[PDB]
Design a protein around this ligand. Structure first.
Ligand SMILES: [Mg+2]
Ligand SMILES: [Mg+2]
Ligand SMILES: [Mg+2]
Ligand SMILES: [Mg+2]
Ligand SMILES: [Mg+2]
Ligand SMILES: [Mg+2]
Ligand code: NA
Ligand code: NA
Ligand code: NA
Ligand code: NA
Ligand code: NA
Ligand code: NA
Ligand code: NA
Ligand code: NA
Lengths: 1015, 1015
């Protein structure tokens, strides 16, 4: 029957004998345990070692397994993904389905995981009531047997499947057998851009309920106009025998204090001509001056639902955290408790580099802490309902949640092929309705989502309306089919740009500013995905936030995404390394596209996280003369844990500082008058830095946490006083092959055939391993590469334009190399043409001026052919002989910053170990640049000017040629790139060019100057 | 597998291996055949004799039956309901489910019909392409086998279930085996108020399609503002291998004239980021000055869809009738082709008294013709999709159709228990979606309905939105949950009254006039059910029509209902009689509530049909002096088949008549000035009668068809001239027991103990069989009875009020009986009191004046206690000794008419056989009354006055005591009821008092007078 019916190839069968969905239950038999959320004896964990055997297909599974353990089976931790134990490979594919697209059919070779457990059940559980098993997550479909008897079947990898075991269990020893199929008709609705894994990957539990039981309960909170009064409504449903003595009590608690209570017999109001629900009751509780829930202040109450007899005997209790909040859209604005939200959101997948898609409390809390510490207030469950603990943590720590149905059919052609088909409506409906039934009592959930990337079909409209009917308290959003369809309350595009239209046929991505004002359009716009953080990315992040702050109806977005989906693999010595698509023999695959995180898989931040934190700041600053105006972007809280530190420094040297407590009302302003500062004697630029510091620890941060910063240039005194003329004069020695400049112990050698500074000597010590040469290219970033392949070139990608133009292949041709003696200096003049196939790409004209002080002044003037693709950089590079421990610079830092991602960086004197000047992106690229640098110190060297630089033990060539960071090897000496100019990194998306025009090197002619000396 | 899975007790399983729903297909392989709608060689009927065996449960079916005919099986006609063949009892229950309410479970005793067929298949059908079987209707669930091999399973009794037999069939002889279950989880959605039957009750057919095929096609018609231009859009879908040489042509035909044609290869427009549908194409055809479809003028075009190769080789053709019409709601009005409809509708069940629920073309045509002849323009498919031919006939004859999903869960408590439950969303969705997929191309379908009497649940909202999304061309309506929910475009209440509110909790039925203007309400209102035509009913029909005409947003309604659901049974003599609920041993049952029709089951009209025809007239009339103003209520057609006949008569005697051609524009007026009419010499009332006559036959009516009529009183000349005094003088003979009056061969006898005229003689011949006595009661009508039972009294019902007050048991007490001699007459004076348990209900005071002419003038003055329930009638009753062939009267006729149902009746001289003065309602009651009667003649008797009367061979007692018409026996002589006053019959509904105040006998004191003589 089981093998014959092939229920995993039938979208009309999504379950057999599965119990109804409901909010989290524990069946407390003690009301106080329910109130305080203590463990329940009635809810037992089956998270232990199970027996496991892997089979190539369900047809290969022996019947004996239903009754007896297989001798060949292993013992494995559950929950787990069986790919993480090496039974087969995880597959990373983005859009293209991992299986042949032939719905509802799956491959005959269908990896089958056979799980079994021998466990004890006490007779007390079987003498009365109902024992159910709960599988919180099984990927992707499964049949269940208990003591050799078939119980049921379930689909949807991301919601709990529950089965009544009461008639299957015996007192003492029992055996569960779970046959998990990797592929099913459900897989067609599970095409999310993530590792394709399988197994029992969320908690398994047994729950005992009385025969007369709470089967469901819904909590709603409605408010008056100023939120000074609330009514809590709790609808409670029961199963079992109705009796006149049965009662439901709902009590509301603020910590230790009961603030309200209501008791009633069963029997709801008259619904229609046939009467009402005899098995339901609604309790209504008045609450005066409720403490309101928000991400700013996650005030929670506890609702306890008691099923009991009239004479006071408890039957069972259930409970939930209640957050008093109202979500509504009014006049085109998403409002929370009457105030317009600004969503500082991020998309978060459930990913662990060791455990795959198994989530633990520690990792969840780590993520939430890091999110809040980085000024995020919102998370999107991309793209499925999460582990149930996630919502409880968001309730308590305070994050806004978009809860999203496990529906993605991205690889279909067209994308709505299944979602417009009524035969797939039953399957889709269950993914939506069962999510709502599970999660509707969580205050952190403020918006429902119908899924992701599934086009727009009639099934979406139907389910949109279903949600609106059953839960009017939350807007519904859905991006598919152009982001502004009839199935969405919120214009929720993915990767729509700030100012630039992308007018794709049928599904255009308008500029977000333009989108709001399209004829007839009135809805708020919140990007469901934006700022694709793949590798060295988040270029132009500030452009979004400027727009969000300027336009009331631009209410923010969710960054894509939180965490790199890299997996751990081990070399021959047991050393771990980060792996991406293809590293497991998985093919076809989408390589490094699984890594789009603000943090690495181990939760180490990428540099881009600081840019996010800064732009998402909750305090805004203006400077007018002596006054600092601080504006609060908080909606609800006063600044009762905030003090402003200010500091004035002259080229990094502190001259004055102080602190002022912040006392700013939500949306309010505070004016801070700086004391009159002394004018410094020496020349240079004065810089003001302010930082907002939280003196007191919170649930989510340590004492001294910095939440905001800003800088301004103050007075500048230009250096006019001439350097005292040195007595020494350098001498020029000329040969046919070289110009040699000597200043006592110092030598500079210019090769006359190449025209470059080929060597520098400090006595007998060589300073260079490679000549100082112009560089116009960078080891391409993920954004430069996009979706290009060796198999299939994308001619539009920056890297392919640079390659085709011969930028990487261009050879320098010497046009001019001359040497002149001045009164106190030697002047070397050079000109080079970079050419490819007879076409001149760049001309570099340089002067090197070496004077008696031993300083080499380099002037560089570059022409770039207007018809060549704009170059990645305009700079110099060399391999220095020296390897020094520290890098010291006066410029923007401390972290990596690029021209379109430098707002978070502060101008100061920074000092880091060399290793910190390299960013270990899993896929190597140009990295570690610091911009706006006026002075750089490394070993014996000092460079001064106004430049961008990176410094590391890796050449651009090696970074370009190496696909994985763990394969990089430190080269001899140190590679230095000093750029007059560097192209933006972009990141609006990572599959088309996204570097904004103002950050492309299009000026045609470029000038920079450097001074190189020994310090 | 089949027995173990129990798919019929699982709402998650509505089918197995069933093909997608689609519009009617025939797979023509010739384009001209498709165009002319001739039979297709590729569509074969399996409507022949099948083998049938009945079993008590599916478990009792022998395995051998899959392979071999059961010798004990019978050869039966298919389509059929097996109850109609006597294999088990049909069940009539209204609301209460015929099975224990325990979803999704059905009784273990589940009647099972085993159908089988040995049939031949042509070799050519199997050599190429696809052979499918189509079951148009199987009640209620079935498994299918072919040549012993299991094919599939299907639910939903009212839509076709189709299965691919290509892999199952052999050339030559094949055997189908169909196991049909009476009860399934589907039964929970099929609780319509009708006989509960089962079997293969609609067509079975085989369809051959090519491998490369048209799998679906949708036709839409859009118009400019004045409907002078149209675009026909045809979306065509294919299945099979796509080839670049494939083409679709859509040609549109107006009769023999091709109007437009378009050809394209496959490949739709880009839909989303993944492209478009490669397997679809949309053709757009321009149509100048299209002939528009309406019920008034059902103009049709033919659309032919050809799948072919580029070189011109036809693969296959499909086709449909196209009606160019637009249905929209604008400014609160339902518009067809820009004009506001007035729905003259009726609910029609599919019912045949011999064949049960099997429909045939002849009966359908008979129904449509009778509907249109009686001024109906609309039909509601209560409460399920109809036999596919129904829509074709409505397309061609011109009726507006409400197509309704097969969803009714009336007996649930509360009514929305299933429809609000997401577990039942899949089963409900299929009932809606598969209906739309089948019927969306029919122009006659103007409104979609979500089902009937299933409360209002979130599933309704989802499916409402689904329809609105897939088909914006038709409004969606649904009555459940109060008739004005978010799941309806039209306020569509059932049995809402005209002026009287019925403020039921949660689901009030407001006055329809009041409902329209409720705060915020803007929608049109069309009653989905009104004017419950159960038995002697349709009292107050005129009140609805007056309101419909006065209020723009009251756009009519659908009468409940077309045809009595009586069934034919046979008594000992083999004689057929009409049976209702309970007559098959079915229990519980709802007795005569299955009979609510305007026509008897054999399509003979009830008297109420004429009231409907008259009120639904399309011409309105006013009289002013000599001028008749005729107003047309047609929206589209001119009166191009109409003339007006007028007639003026003095008390039934013709004086003048004439004919005038009608030339009225739609919504226009025509003024007709009557010629100078000669003044009548003799006394009496002149009456003007006009009739609209259709001189020419149509598709739906005969030459001479009368479509409308109206009457007015003109001049009246009151009789002032004294009758010449007769020389004869009556003599009074007085005894202790009697007063006797003699006048020649005539005698009148008044019993002095009873106080009534006990006998009259013409010579020696007795005239009376019972004395002439007052009567205050009637044999109760269905409307008087309502839902009352002997086991459960409804004290509110009229009959129970009359019974409780002792009206039926009240005995006449003589207060006074005196005789006096006048100058030329004898005067008998009587007074009676009717009393029950010491309470005086009625007092009757009479004078009988017998003069020399042999005339007896009776004056009656009645007092009715203000605190007794108002009596059903105030009149006289006697059993006449004579039985005469004819009844002749001057008054309202010719048909039965009552005070609240007499607008259709005309004043004239009528002459009918006695049998026509009895209405054979299947449930006997007071019947055959004629109102406004000034003269009545029967045998030697004449009664003059202003009275209502009925006359028949049945006493009120027998009518009241006899449950079925076939059990009535003509009594000796003739029963005459002559009423001064008679209570209305009501009928707004038939479960609560529905007689309007103005038709209740509440005046307290009543006067009437009669003259009894011998003409
Ligand atoms: Mg399935
Ligand atoms: Mg995707
Ligand atoms: Mg800044
Ligand atoms: Mg079923
Ligand atoms: Mg009903
Ligand atoms: Mg009239
Ligand atoms: Na904004
Ligand atoms: Na990705
Ligand atoms: Na503060
Ligand atoms: Na690389
Ligand atoms: Na009207
Ligand atoms: Na009925
Ligand atoms: Na005419
Ligand atoms: Na009767």
């Amino acid at each position: 029957v089981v093998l014959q019916r092939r229920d995993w190839e039938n979208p009309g069968v999504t379950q057999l004998n599965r119990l109804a969905a409901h909010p989290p239950f524990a069946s407390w038999r003690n009301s106080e345990e329910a109130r305080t959320d203590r463990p329940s004896q009635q809810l037992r964990s089956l998270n232990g070692e199970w027996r496991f055997a892997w089979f190539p297909a369900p047809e290969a599974v022996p019947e004996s397994w239903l009754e007896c353990d297989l001798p060949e089976a292993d013992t494995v931790v559950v929950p787990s993904n069986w790919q993480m134990h090496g039974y087969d490979a995880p597959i990373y594919t983005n859009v293209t389905y991992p299986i042949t697209v032939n719905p509802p059919f799956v491959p005959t070779e269908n990896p089958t995981g056979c799980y079994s457990l021998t466990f004890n059940v006490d007779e007390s559980w079987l003498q009365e009531g109902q024992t159910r098993i709960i599988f919180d997550g099984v990927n992707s479909a499964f049949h269940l047997w208990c003591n050799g008897r078939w119980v049921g079947y379930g689909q949807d990898s991301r919601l709990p499947s529950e089965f009544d075991l009461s008639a299957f269990l015996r007192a003492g020893e029992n055996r569960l057998a779970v046959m998990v199929l990797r592929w099913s008709d459900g897989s067609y609705l599970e095409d999310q851009d993530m590792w394709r894994m399988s197994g029992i990957f969320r908690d398994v539990s047994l729950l005992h309920k009385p025969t007369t039981q709470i089967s469901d309960f819904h909590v709603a909170t409605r408010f008056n106009d100023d939120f000074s009064r609330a009514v809590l409504e709790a609808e409670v449903q029961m199963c079992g025998e109705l009796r006149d003595y049965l009662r439901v009590t709902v009590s509301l608690w603020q910590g230790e204090t009961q603030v309200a209570s209501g008791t009633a017999p069963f029997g709801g109001e008259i619904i229609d001509e046939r009467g009402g629900y005899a098995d339901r009751v609604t309790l209504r509780l008045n609450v005066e001056n409720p403490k309101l829930w928000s991400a700013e202040i996650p005030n929670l109450y506890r609702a306890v639902v008691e099923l009991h007899t009239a004479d006071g005997t408890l039957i069972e209790a259930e409970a939930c955290d209640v957050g008093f909040r109202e979500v509504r859209i009014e006049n085109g604005l998403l409002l929370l408790n009457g105030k317009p939200l600004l969503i500082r959101g991020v998309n978060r997948h459930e990913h662990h580099p060791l455990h795959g898609q198994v989530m633990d409390e520690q990792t969840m809390v780590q993520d939430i802490l890091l999110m809040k510490q980085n000024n995020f207030n919102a998370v999107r469950c991309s793209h499925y309902p999460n582990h149930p603990l996630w919502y409880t943590l968001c309730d308590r720590y305070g994050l806004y949640v978009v809860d999203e149905a496990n529906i993605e059919t991205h690889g279909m052609v067209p994308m709505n092929r299944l979602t417009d088909d009524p035969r797939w409506l039953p399957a889709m409906s269950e993914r939506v309705t069962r999510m709502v039934q599970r999660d509707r009592n969580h205050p952190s959930v403020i918006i429902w989502s119908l899924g992701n990337e599934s086009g727009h079909g009639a099934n979406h409209d139907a389910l949109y309306r279903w949600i609106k009917s059953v839960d009017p308290s939350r807007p519904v959003q859905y991006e598919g089919g152009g982001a502004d369809t009839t199935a969405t309350d919120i214009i929720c595009p993915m990767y729509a740009r700030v100012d630039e239209d992308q007018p794709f046929p049928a599904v255009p991505k308008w500029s977000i500013k333009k989108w709001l004002s399209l004829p007839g359009e009135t809805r708020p716009l919140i990007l469901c995905e934006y700022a694709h953080a793949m590798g060295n990315s988040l270029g132009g992040f500030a452009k979004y936030w400027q727009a969000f702050r300027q336009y009331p109806r631009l209410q923010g977005g969710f960054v894509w995404d939180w965490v790199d989906q890299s997996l751990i693999k081990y070399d021959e010595n047991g050393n771990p390394w980060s792996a991406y698509g293809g590293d497991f023999g998985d093919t076809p695959n989408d390589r490094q596209f699984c890594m789009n995180g603000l943090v690495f898989a181990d939760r180490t931040p990428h540099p881009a996280l600081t840019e996010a934190k800064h732009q998402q700041q909750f305090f805004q600053f203006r400077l007018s003369g002596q006054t600092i105006e601080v504006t609060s972007e908080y909606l609800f809280r006063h600044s009762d844990n905030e003090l402003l530190h200010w500091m004035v420094a002259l080229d990094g040297k502190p001259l004055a500082s102080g602190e002022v407590p912040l006392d700013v009302a939500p949306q309010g302003k505070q004016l801070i008058e700086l004391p009159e500062l002394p004018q410094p004697e020496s020349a240079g630029q004065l810089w003001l830095t302010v930082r907002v510091v939280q003196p007191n620890a919170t649930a989510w941060s340590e004492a001294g946490h910095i939440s905001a910063w800003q800088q301004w240039r103050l007075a500048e005194n230009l250096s006019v006083t001439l350097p005292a003329a040195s007595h020494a004069i350098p001498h020029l020695t000329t040969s046919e092959m070289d110009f040699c400049i000597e200043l006592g112990n110092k030598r500079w050698q210019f090769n006359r055939q190449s025209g470059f500074l080929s060597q520098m000597w400090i006595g007998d010590k060589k300073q260079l391993l490679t000549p100082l040469r112009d560089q116009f290219t960078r080891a391409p970033l993920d954004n430069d590469i996009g979706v290009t392949e060796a198999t299939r070139i994308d001619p539009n990608a920056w890297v392919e334009r640079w390659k085709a133009a011969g930028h990487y292949q261009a050879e320098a041709a010497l046009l001019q190399c001359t040497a002149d003696t001045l009164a106190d200096a030697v002047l070397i003049t050079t000109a080079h043409a970079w050419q490819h196939q007879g076409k001149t790409l760049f001309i570099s004209r340089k002067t090197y001026r070496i004077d008696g002080s031993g300083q080499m002044a380099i002037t560089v003037d570059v022409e770039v052919a207007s018809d060549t693709p704009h170059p990645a950089r305009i700079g110099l590079n060399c391999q220095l002989a020296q390897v020094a421990e520290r890098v010291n610079w006066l410029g923007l830092g401390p972290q990596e910053n690029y021209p379109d991602r430098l707002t978070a960086a502060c101008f100061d004197r920074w000092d880091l170990p060399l290793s910190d000047m390299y960013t270990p992106y899993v896929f190597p690229s140009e990295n570690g640049l610091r911009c706006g640098t006026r002075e750089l110190n490394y070993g014996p060297h000092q460079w001064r000017g106004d430049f961008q630089f990176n410094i590391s033990r890796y050449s651009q060539q090696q970074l370009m040629e190496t696909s994985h960071r763990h394969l990089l090897h430190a080269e001899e000496g140190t590679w230095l790139n000093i750029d007059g100019f560097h192209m933006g990194i972009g990141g609006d998306d990572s599959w088309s060019p996204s570097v904004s025009a103002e950050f492309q090197l299009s000026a045609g002619r470029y000038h920079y100057q450097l001074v190189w000396c020994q310090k």
